[PDB]
Design an enzyme around this catalytic site. Sequence first.
Site, mmCIF file in Angstrom:
data_model
loop_
_atom_site.group_PDB
_atom_site.id
_atom_site.type_symbol
_atom_site.label_atom_id
_atom_site.label_comp_id
_atom_site.label_asym_id
_atom_site.label_seq_id
_atom_site.Cartn_x
_atom_site.Cartn_y
_atom_site.Cartn_z
ATOM 1 C CG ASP A 1 -28.529 55.349 -9.033
ATOM 2 O OD1 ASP A 1 -28.358 54.162 -9.540
ATOM 3 O OD2 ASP A 1 -27.962 56.240 -9.718
ATOM 4 C CB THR B 1 -29.916 49.961 -5.706
ATOM 5 O OG1 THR B 1 -29.753 50.979 -6.324
ATOM 6 C CG2 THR B 1 -31.186 49.913 -4.955
ATOM 7 N NE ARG C 1 -17.771 66.419 -19.924
ATOM 8 C CZ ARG C 1 -18.166 67.377 -20.701
ATOM 9 N NH1 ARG C 1 -19.243 68.060 -20.667
ATOM 10 N NH2 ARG C 1 -17.067 68.052 -21.372
ATOM 11 C CB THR D 1 -20.095 67.811 -24.400
ATOM 12 O OG1 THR D 1 -19.909 68.925 -23.369
ATOM 13 C CG2 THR D 1 -19.342 68.343 -25.520
ATOM 14 C CG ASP E 1 -12.536 79.921 -20.255
ATOM 15 O OD1 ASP E 1 -14.043 79.550 -19.932
ATOM 16 O OD2 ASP E 1 -12.149 78.936 -20.707
HETATM 17 O O1 LIG Z 1 -18.233 76.889 -21.911
HETATM 18 C C1 LIG Z 1 -18.594 75.697 -22.607
HETATM 19 O O2 LIG Z 1 -19.605 75.868 -23.218
HETATM 20 C C2 LIG Z 1 -17.470 74.795 -22.593
HETATM 21 C C3 LIG Z 1 -17.901 73.361 -22.882
HETATM 22 C C4 LIG Z 1 -16.940 72.378 -22.745
HETATM 23 C C5 LIG Z 1 -17.430 71.131 -23.190
HETATM 24 O O3 LIG Z 1 -18.687 71.143 -23.468
HETATM 25 O O4 LIG Z 1 -16.826 70.116 -23.165
HETATM 26 C C6 LIG Z 1 -15.482 72.644 -22.118
HETATM 27 C C7 LIG Z 1 -15.594 73.949 -21.862
HETATM 28 N N1 LIG Z 1 -16.452 74.801 -21.831
HETATM 29 C C8 LIG Z 1 -14.383 74.148 -21.137
HETATM 30 O O5 LIG Z 1 -14.090 75.484 -20.809
HETATM 31 C C9 LIG Z 1 -13.002 73.505 -21.226
HETATM 32 O O6 LIG Z 1 -12.395 73.896 -20.259
HETATM 33 C C10 LIG Z 1 -13.452 72.263 -21.407
HETATM 34 C C11 LIG Z 1 -12.620 71.169 -20.960
HETATM 35 C C12 LIG Z 1 -13.237 70.093 -21.609
HETATM 36 C C13 LIG Z 1 -12.942 68.649 -21.485
HETATM 37 O O7 LIG Z 1 -13.676 67.693 -21.987
HETATM 38 O O8 LIG Z 1 -11.746 68.195 -21.554
HETATM 39 N N2 LIG Z 1 -14.465 70.409 -21.949
HETATM 40 C C14 LIG Z 1 -14.558 71.825 -21.722
HETATM 41 CA CA LIG Z 2 -27.356 51.920 -8.198
HETATM 42 CA CA LIG Z 3 -15.677 77.603 -21.344
#
Ligand SMILES: O=C(O)c1cc(C(=O)O)c2c(n1)C(=O)C(=O)c1cc(C(=O)O)[nH]c1-2
Ligand SMILES: [Ca+2]
Ligand SMILES: [Ca+2]
Lengths: 582, 582
Positions: free
Chosen positions: B11, B14, B111, B155, B316
């Site tokens: 991937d 190509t 995503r 996500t 965190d």
């Molecule tokens: O710990 C998790 O399980 C979790 C998930 C996600 C997420 O799923 O989008 C975010 C975060 N953490 C997170 O810390 C946060 O900083 C964050 C920013 C974003 C983004 O899409 O803007 N998602 C995430």
């Molecule tokens: Ca490709």
């Molecule tokens: Ca988090």
Amino acid sequence: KDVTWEDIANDDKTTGDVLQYGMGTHAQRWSPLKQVNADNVFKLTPAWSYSFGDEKQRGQESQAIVSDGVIYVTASYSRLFALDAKTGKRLWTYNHRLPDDIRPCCDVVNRGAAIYGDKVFFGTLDASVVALNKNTGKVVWKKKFADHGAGYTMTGAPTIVKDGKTGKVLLIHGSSGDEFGVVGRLFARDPDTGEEIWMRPFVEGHMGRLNGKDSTVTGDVKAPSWPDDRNSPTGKVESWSHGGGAPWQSASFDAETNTIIVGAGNPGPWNTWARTAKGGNPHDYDSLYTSGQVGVDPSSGEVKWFYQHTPNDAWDFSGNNELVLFDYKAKDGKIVKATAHADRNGFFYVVDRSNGKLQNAFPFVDNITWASHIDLKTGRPVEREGQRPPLPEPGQKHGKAVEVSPPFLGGKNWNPMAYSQDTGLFYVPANHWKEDYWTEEVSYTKGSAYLGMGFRIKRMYDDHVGSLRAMDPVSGKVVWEHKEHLPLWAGVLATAGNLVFTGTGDGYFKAFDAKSGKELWKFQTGSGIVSPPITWEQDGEQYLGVTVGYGGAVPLWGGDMADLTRPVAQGGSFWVFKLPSW
Amino acid sequence: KDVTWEDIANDDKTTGDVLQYGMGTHAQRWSPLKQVNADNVFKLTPAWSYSFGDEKQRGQESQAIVSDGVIYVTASYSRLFALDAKTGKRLWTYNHRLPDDIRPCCDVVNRGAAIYGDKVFFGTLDASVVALNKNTGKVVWKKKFADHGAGYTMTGAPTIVKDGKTGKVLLIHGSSGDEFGVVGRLFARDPDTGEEIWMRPFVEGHMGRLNGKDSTVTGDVKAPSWPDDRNSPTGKVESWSHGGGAPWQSASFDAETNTIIVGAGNPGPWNTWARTAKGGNPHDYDSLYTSGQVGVDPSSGEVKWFYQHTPNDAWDFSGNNELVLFDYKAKDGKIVKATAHADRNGFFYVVDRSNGKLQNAFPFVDNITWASHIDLKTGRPVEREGQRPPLPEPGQKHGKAVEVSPPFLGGKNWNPMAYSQDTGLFYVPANHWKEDYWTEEVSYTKGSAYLGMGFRIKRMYDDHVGSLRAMDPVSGKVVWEHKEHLPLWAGVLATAGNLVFTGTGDGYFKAFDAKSGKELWKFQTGSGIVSPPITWEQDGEQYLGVTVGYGGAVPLWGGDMADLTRPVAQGGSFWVFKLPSW
Ligand SMILES: O=C(O)c1cc(C(=O)O)c2c(n1)C(=O)C(=O)c1cc(C(=O)O)[nH]c1-2
Ligand SMILES: [Ca+2]
Ligand SMILES: [Ca+2]
Ligand SMILES: O=C(O)c1cc(C(=O)O)c2c(n1)C(=O)C(=O)c1cc(C(=O)O)[nH]c1-2
Ligand SMILES: [Ca+2]
Ligand SMILES: [Ca+2]
């Protein structure tokens, strides 16, 4: 010299601004710009795009206003955005709080603003008019003129005009709600205070206002054109108080006679029998001042003259489409200062703007059935036999359906036509389609729709709906036709680059050759386009602007046509196009 | 033969398609296309846009994928769109029905999808995985793998793998929910049925599954790195049942050793004191398997190695940012097959992908306050004196505040970096900022957030927030920097044309020179950009594309940076760009 009367007055001549709905007082939708022309169009390119966001989409009908490098633009759900012409930077925005009991008939659209002095102006869906400072987003005055709960709104652009008699500058705006059984009204206001100078009803026999207190009455008081009733309080039938004639589009203005030229909308209820004596004939029961072009005196708001287009609108052929002032060269010799109009009811009208005397009338859409032609010595359409659909048989709450064309959505709707100074032709965004129409039960209830008919919209032809058409105003001929699979709902713009521009239902912005109709250039913006584009010069460069985001009446009232249009996506943006600087 | 393991495995080479998040199994975001380059880049122009509509906007984080002629793109609120790559015309849509009570932490985003055989794949916000037929959008299977009411979502993009031992093709996906008290889990599924092959928990001492039955325990059964609690039913402190370490982003895959390499998220609650024995020391109570990079066996779901980024993550600093695979030419001498990572904690790591051992570590952001450096023989941070905030003095309902940097949003969030095979450099989308942090009470309550801390994000510098930096992985130097006024929250794409591409929060898609950092080109799209751009060649043309529509964590958790960002417009749309034909 920040936005004066003469800037407005000269507005079709000055290529570096755009100050009102129509690109001039004559509303010609014309420009002398030629940087962009027929040999270089192939290179046009997006310069930037602005998204309206807020999770608020639906139809985007607005024509943008540019003054000293600030685009002023309106969006669905009563918003106004002010943007940097060159970058697409946002300067400020205004959001109107909208009550929860609003009832616009045909989607939460807005058609434009006006600029005068240092203020920006526009109408709102809860029936108000708001004034803002063009530099700040600060509200200067607000007036709410009608009960929204009874059916009024405002969707159309306001215009600015100067009384050549009293010297005063006025703000001109209309009202909306024929479908809700409202009494339509025209208004004049003071730009700096929004104080009512004059108010004028457009159903015959209603009481008009002047400098704050009642004034005169539109025509005869007895109101001979509506059927009488010696049982009700007014002596007139119920429809008389719910008559309609709302000017929901915009005025046009002629300095040479000191006249406002505005359209009146369809009368209420749709049904011809609510507005005809029992027994009786709907032939001379005209529903006076409805579905025609009205000439208005700026100083007092009294009716100067009137040319009606559908004497007893049975079909909701709302007859307030725009009026472009052109110089009519008869057919041999006599130049006449005229009005031109492509109506909902399928015909094109050439009217003498000195007194509302019909000069030429002819079809612009193929297979018409409610009328065979417009009888020229009389100014009256010659109808066809079953076209006012019959009342139910005894025992039936629906009557017999008759096939009509065009349908209520019309030959052309509000989306507007352009006039070309070089070719002499009017470029009309029309459609080809029809319906089943039938009588039902009629009765008024405040806040409810007040039609009294049933309907269905359907195709006319198998291969297309929208029809770009170049019409010659003297012979009544179709010089050229461009056809499209979806309906057409965007304005048209004409330029001295020998170009015609519009947008389509499936999202392209397009350029056509103005003498032949050939498609020269298109760009897919991502949503269907339902507004009028504009063009302008900026620090030596030609720019184009179009507002993007599908909507309006088709989705809600189109019938088969709603179904065709189900896969078009929603949107909400402004886009600026130009030639690559490199 | 439509999209086979050999399509996926080659991937990165190509130029014709894009089959997964990261544009290869090593996640490099590198393209050998050179049609668009540093000398001609100033002519790049939009080719078409598509509007997502539905009045559904918020953050648009998706990486599109391409193959045959079709673009598969994901949108906010669980929706998938298949678009014709040349024209932007919509081929089909799939809208998942969502319940009213999902609780993603950081906006309603996605995503990307994955692809294999005749199928497309993506995660949904009510924690499910769905499979769709590629040619139309019908659903083939769909698996709800956890309970959204207790705080699980999804996500991140899934990915496709081939276990070398067994011969079997697997669909790999993680979970999300550390802020709600969850047990972070990784899953392998059969691509045609949806059937769980294995499930592995990333909190120490939790049970795995293999072929639907309980299998082995992660690490030691007694979970010595989590505090004990006689008097509790599990034998452990409460937080061990809600411990986190969710793998919310995506895997990378190395076929030479047969290892699945992924990140695990932060431990739950943020409060270090709920994961430390009463009156003991946060040091060595590690909170095993959180905030690090994990090497996993595709055959059984078992952990082969682990490298911790932050041992008792009190801040965190969610330690699961992407892992890029590359060849590290030691300092002098050796070529190590490595991992590359830019952690939320502000330290770049370089680790040996055969055994998890630390080769080098240096800071990519400038004002780190929690730790002095990373000790290269130990593998551990050398923490500073009072940077784990103290408990509330007896009688208080919050503890005193300490200044930390970076803040929980990170030196780098999810928005991935890219690598240039020509220059040797890492291009990281970093930010300079900081916060006030303090302690609160901690208690678990099903379906409600589990922090135990208060916080307030604040700028570090007056002239810029976002910091686009080119990092040298052998010496640790910032070779070039580009500075932006708002946070940086998009992916980076790197090409053989001497170019790097990214998007800004004020709506510009931009091009920089890869060797010097100079901005060469920019286009205003309308809303802030928060997605990773791609590129592909078709009919001798090089296309660039990008997902547009501002959102993500900043507008909700950002504080002062939530207010800086307030006037940036929502949107939702895809854009493709190209060189002009002429
Ligand atoms: O710990 C998790 O399980 C979790 C998930 C996600 C997420 O799923 O989008 C975010 C975060 N953490 C997170 O810390 C946060 O900083 C964050 C920013 C974003 C983004 O899409 O803007 N998602 C995430
Ligand atoms: Ca490709
Ligand atoms: Ca988090
Ligand atoms: O008579 C009315 O009072 C009234 C108002 C409007 C409107 O305000 O937009 C529509 C109409 N009429 C109407 O017949 C209609 O077909 C129409 C379509 C559109 C639209 O914006 O697409 N507006 C309206
Ligand atoms: Ca002008
Ligand atoms: Ca109407």
